[PDB]
Design a binder for this molecule. Structure first.
Ligand SMILES: O=c1ccn([C@@H]2O[C@H](COP(=O)(O)OP(=O)(O)O[C@H]3O[C@H](CO)[C@@H](O)[C@H](O)[C@H]3O)[C@@H](O)[C@H]2O)c(=O)[nH]1
Ligand SMILES: O=c1ccn([C@@H]2O[C@H](COP(=O)(O)OP(=O)(O)O[C@H]3O[C@H](CO)[C@@H](O)[C@H](O)[C@H]3O)[C@@H](O)[C@H]2O)c(=O)[nH]1
Ligand SMILES: O=c1ccn([C@@H]2O[C@H](COP(=O)(O)OP(=O)(O)O[C@H]3O[C@H](CO)[C@@H](O)[C@H](O)[C@H]3O)[C@@H](O)[C@H]2O)c(=O)[nH]1
Ligand SMILES: O=c1ccn([C@@H]2O[C@H](COP(=O)(O)OP(=O)(O)O[C@H]3O[C@H](CO)[C@@H](O)[C@H](O)[C@H]3O)[C@@H](O)[C@H]2O)c(=O)[nH]1
Ligand SMILES: [Mg+2]
Ligand SMILES: [Mg+2]
Ligand SMILES: [Mg+2]
Ligand SMILES: [Mg+2]
Ligand SMILES: [Mg+2]
Ligand SMILES: [Mg+2]
Ligand SMILES: [Mg+2]
Ligand SMILES: [Mg+2]
Ligand SMILES: [Mg+2]
Ligand SMILES: [Mg+2]
Ligand SMILES: [Mg+2]
Ligand SMILES: [Mg+2]
Lengths: 264, 264, 265, 263
């Protein structure tokens, strides 16, 4: 059982400025509910009980949201159940040096165990099938190796994401042969894009500590995974469910509008 | 002239629950900018230099936002830093949620014996070729030297969500209020002229507020005190020029968000 | 009746570094109670109902302290709770540390055109055989209707840490101020009547502050503004009754603490 | 070696009420320095690099204190050093259910590894000797078992501390036979009182899980240590150095006066 889920939330969110100068992008609402809460509910379903959060300058709002306070009830029951059932842990990333560096800072909260990772700006809704992390948690029980979530996208979208090169194993399961962070579409090894959902074995921490800066001069978890994938097998998983890239303004709006209609 | 502008920001904003349990509704972003920043910019253009805020349970986000901090990251941060170095922010806590009228009364400590502006940031006002709604009102005030409340004609099916006036046409877009009613059913609406979150208030409004008893939804309403003033002397209603989105409602919040995005 | 009291609390408190990088010096406890609570309680006894606080970077400790959160806990809590339920707290941020004078000028947005009280919390005043210091002053304002600044006689050796006045005796404990100087060297002191952190100021003090240039330590001094006011019209100095500890200094901080302990005992 | 140090800071501090309403007692200043800063310096000297803090209802002041900010320089040298060298982690103790429970909560920040624990209200000032934790860190190296700092106190004081029953192994080292939390004078098994300094082997977490409320209906680390002591060998170390119980106002005052004189 993967008991810990690490949530990186120390990124600038330069694109949602000026509000991200105070409110982490992971705290932005889809209308009435922050991205991070959906992520937490997801991790819970997957079986996690310890939500480890890596924070930046804007630690306050994130931390206060998950601390004790006070169809109203309806709106507050889930966050209340979250606060009661989960143990929240926090560590501060001293400098914005990349996603990989964030996860490496998170070592203080994880220790020597495989663990889950959720990039909250990727809102994944699947409510017909188990949550995305849960799908991967079940896969992990069989494979016992790092797992990276993937989705087919248009080549025109590739330069925004990590892209793999994999060899089919079973339905929707690939053994990652190679990975590249944000390639030009001409250089993209496939249309299989990485999404903010991973299950990582702890040897990943030692690998991160020796992973140099890459794309945008940031320590990328992609390069660490590429290294791991060349020492032993790690898999990529085409999850079932809907994903909105809320790290993008386009995705943020479409998720908000979708929710609005659902609310009807 | 009007140098202070009171910003009530201590209501529950329940329909936006659970995020409002930590993030006040005035802090919700259209996409990248919180409602309150638009209101503040509108107050500045109107000549205000003191931004007085009535806080509730979660003022941490507000105070943090207007406190100094550290291409389009530059252009995204230009106005806010201008606001922070230019304006003077003061604060007072509304002990209990007893109505917009009480929040204004509580705001007396920050105002004193002087006419002032009041902005309800949940009403996002966009004036493109015209001055900000408050600036328009500021001009009016120079002539009339009396309370002024912003109105707009709305379909009668909406009249039940707002305060409504019965008035005498003084001049182009100007009426003398002879009565006001907070949230009447369609059957009883005095007219289709609804009140929006913009007011200029003479200071005798505080003693009136001091004697105003709970009204609609067991809340001390600014509408009821304005009715009292209206019957003691002349106050006016101004059909402002410009587009207003009621972001106090999810439907308005969503429309404003879609609007800003298309303009991006 | 003076209803508002301004509490400057935006200073650095350098002598209490590193703790003052997070906890403003006015929040430092005498053992179990921060300096500022004693000040607020004193203002309340004087009749003030609005506690206008000028903040700096350490606002959080101050703001949270006076906000709602709550014979064991009880008795130790009754006072602060009474305070939080009866008083109205307002805040303004002194954008930059430019001096007590500029801190009070920044405080104008919370005061307005009315006379008001000012308390410098690092000056702990205990005097319960008589009314609190500020209240002694509030009574005096009723008569004189002008600015009042608290003074205490000190040794020529301490004179250099305070503002000092030159006055003329009007009546018991009252002096019409003829001149004021901030932190004069022991040789240049006009007297031994040193100013302490307590004032009642008439509203014209703001306009005077707006034209007061940086004085000692390149900071705008309320002292220089009071000197200006004193030469313009009548303003007095009141020799208060009660004991005062300069908790603005580590020596006075320790003394008051030991003093309180010997009492808690 | 021991890389992490746990710092419980979630207790009520009813003693120092009202200020402890907003500020944790571990944050109370001696004169210009908060208790917790002395403890962190001590831990650092002991070789610790991860400072794991267990927080309560008032974490803002403690977290902000150890977060980047900006003789003023002589005053900020240490904390600047600390903030730039240490890794601080946080976890919330939901209900104040005792020191042992606070430590159990800290499991998420520790994991399965030996770790140190410092109760910051116990101010330990080592003159010519290394820090109390450094002394213990060295001892563990030899013993490889839980270590609990002790001090011989006066019998009339015994009732406010955990007390051991031990057997002399070597200079200032006792194998613990039993432990009781805050026994009355008449029932004290000795005059060797526990002080807020421990090195603990990870099996203490499971034991703590099984430890029911004891003294003052609180889950006590002393009872978990007692259980560990009967289960296998653990030691008590009579440290070299001066200790003030700043958990009591009398101690707080004495420490403040002492620091003042150092001038
Ligand atoms: O120094 C940092 C940088 C980022 N983050 C956080 O890490 C996450 C991801 O950051 P972001 O910049 O938004 O990453 P992306 O550019 O979107 O890319 C990541 O996520 C994509 C899918 O969303 C993948 O396809 C990529 O391979 C992966 O790098 C966010 O939660 C950030 O707040 C930190 O905590 N610290
Ligand atoms: O106790 C309170 C209650 C409200 N507010 C604030 O007051 C404002 C308005 O609150 P809201 O709940 O949204 O009131 P409405 O029902 O929208 O009604 C007000 O605003 C309408 C238009 O926006 C008008 O038409 C109404 O007459 C007027 O009462 C917001 O800024 C709130 O945060 C407080 O600060 N404290
Ligand atoms: O920029 C500033 C500077 C100071 N303060 C505050 O002002 C007060 C006084 O500051 P402090 O540095 O302690 O001034 P002192 O040197 O003590 O001097 C003041 O107080 C003395 C007695 O306490 C008097 O005798 C002096 O005339 C008077 O200037 C404190 O509450 C500070 O926090 C601010 O708020 N902002
Ligand atoms: O629920 C709690 C209760 C306490 N604490 C912390 O635990 C520590 C100790 O609390 P305290 O109340 O001061 O305990 P003491 O009564 O002093 O007793 C402890 O410390 C003594 C020495 O100081 C020992 O002799 C005792 O055996 C040991 O229980 C402090 O750091 C507290 O903040 C928590 O974090 N959570
Ligand atoms: Mg970006
Ligand atoms: Mg992203
Ligand atoms: Mg985009
Ligand atoms: Mg509502
Ligand atoms: Mg509204
Ligand atoms: Mg709606
Ligand atoms: Mg100083
Ligand atoms: Mg001083
Ligand atoms: Mg000194
Ligand atoms: Mg206690
Ligand atoms: Mg103790
Ligand atoms: Mg005691």
């Amino acid at each position: 059982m993967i008991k810990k889920c690490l949530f990186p939330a120390a990124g600038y969110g330069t694109r949602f400025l000026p509000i991200t100068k105070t409110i982490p992008k992971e705290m932005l609402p889809i209308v009435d509910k922050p991205l991070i809460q959906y992520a937490v509910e997801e991790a819970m379903e997957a079986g996690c009980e310890v939500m480890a959060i890596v924070t930046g300058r804007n630690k306050r709002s994130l931390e206060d949201y998950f601390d004790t306070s006070y169809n109203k009830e309806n709106a507050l029951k889930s966050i209340r159940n979250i606060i009661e059932k989960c143990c929240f842990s926090y560590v501060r990333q001293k400098q914005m040096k990349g996603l990989g560096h964030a996860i490496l800072t998170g070592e203080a909260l994880i220790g020597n165990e495989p663990f889950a990772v959720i990039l909250a700006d990727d809102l994944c809704i699947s409510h017909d099938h188990p949550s995305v992390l849960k799908q991967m948690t079940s896969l992990y029980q069989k494979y016992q190796c790092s797992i990276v979530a993937i989705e087919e996208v248009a080549l025109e979208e590739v330069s925004k994401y990590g892209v793999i090169r994999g060899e089919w194993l079973e339905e929707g399961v690939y053994e990652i042969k190679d990975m590249v962070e944000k390639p030009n579409q001409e250089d993209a090894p496939s249309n299989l894009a990485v999404i903010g959902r991973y299950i990582l074995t702890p040897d990943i921490f030692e690998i991160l500590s020796e992973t140099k800066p890459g794309k945008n001069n940031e320590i990328q978890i992609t390069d660490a995974l590429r290294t791991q994938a060349k020492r032993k097998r790690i898999i990529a998983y085409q999850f079932k469910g809907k994903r909105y890239d809320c790290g993008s303004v386009e995705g943020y709006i479409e998720a908000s509008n979708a929710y609005y209609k659902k609310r009807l």
